[PDB]
Amino acid sequence: MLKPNVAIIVAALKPALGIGYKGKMPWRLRKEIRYFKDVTTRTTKPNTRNAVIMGRKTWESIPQKFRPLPDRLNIILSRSYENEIIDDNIIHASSIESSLNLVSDVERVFIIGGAEIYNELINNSLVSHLLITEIEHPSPESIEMDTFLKFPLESWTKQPKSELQKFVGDTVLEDDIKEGDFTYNYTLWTRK
Ligand SMILES: NC(=O)C1=CN([C@@H]2O[C@H](COP(=O)(O)OP(=O)(O)OC[C@H]3O[C@@H](n4cnc5c(N)ncnc54)[C@H](OP(=O)(O)O)[C@@H]3O)[C@@H](O)[C@H]2O)C=CC1
Numbered sequence: 412m413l414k415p416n417v418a419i420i421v422a423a424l425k426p427a428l429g430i431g432y433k434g435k436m437p438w439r440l441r442k443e444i445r446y447f448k449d450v451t452t453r454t455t456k457p458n459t460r461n462a463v464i465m466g467r468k469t470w471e472s473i474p475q476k477f478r479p480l481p482d483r484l485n486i487i488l489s490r491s492y493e494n495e496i497i498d499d500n501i502i503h504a505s506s507i508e509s510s511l512n513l514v515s516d517v518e519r520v521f522i523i524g525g526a527e528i529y530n531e532l533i534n535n536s537l538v539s540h541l542l543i544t545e546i547e548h549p550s551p552e553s554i555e556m557d558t559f560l561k562f563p564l565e566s567w568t569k570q571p572k573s574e575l576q577k578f579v580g581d582t583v584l585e586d587d588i589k590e591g592d593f594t595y596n597y598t599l600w601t602r603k
């Protein structure tokens with residue numbers, strides 16, 4: 412695949428954009444996990460699938476029985492990896508671009524974490540869209556977090572809900588979803 416558009420998908424707590432604590436997500440939002448699954452799996456074209464890219468630490472954090480993530484081509488980056496196809500669902504690479512040279516029949520590509528991957532790849536011009544779930548809490552300071560997005564958002568534009576809707580196709584997008592004390596909304600951002 413040559414120079415595909417790539418999207419980042421992440422869930423973050425406003426206003427600091429925290430995304431983790433001691434190697435895990437600081438919340439369990441059930442409807443948000445379901446959204447992540449639908450957006451990253453669904454395709455429109457026939458014989459295609461989407462690819463998900465993750466850092467080695469994220470891959471190793473999935474219980475072995477639950478990997479690879481089903482119904483998507485899994486790409487794992489490590490600076491120590493050779494560019495290799497493991498099987499039809501797993502690719503190892505040391506760079507995003509190298510990895511995409513190994514794929515065919517992919518419709519969309521999503522970066523799914525973690526923090527080091529996000530913070531480095533935001534500055535790669537292949538990244539064209541950010542799917543950020545903006546999480547809000549009455550007392551964000553009470554939530555322990557050690558990992559944060561370092562995104563240059565002054566260079567990106569938040570689009571209207573209509574644009575997100577068109578991006579995700581059929582997926583149901585509810586507004587101000589509440590689970591416990593958290594309220595969240597799905598957003599789409601593109602480069603200015
Ligand atoms: N809020 C959310 O939506 C999500 C949050 N997260 C959070 O992220 C945190 C984990 O992040 P982190 O520990 O940084 O792990 P990562 O998944 O980002 O893995 C980092 C590893 O990826 C490899 N790597 C990183 N950057 C590159 C690069 N530019 N090119 C090639 N290889 C690269 C390296 O592997 P090597 O060391 O082998 O070279 C590096 O050690 C957790 O707290 C998790 O909960 C994760 C996903 C989503």
Ligand SMILES: COc1ccc(Oc2cccc3nc(N)nc(N)c23)cc1
Pocket residue numbers: 420421422443444447469470472473522523524542544
């Ligand atoms: C440990 O394995 C993983 C950890 C996190 C992960 O990414 C997510 C998991 C669950 C919900 C998620 N929601 C959004 N908006 N973005 C992500 N990247 C998500 C995917 C795999």
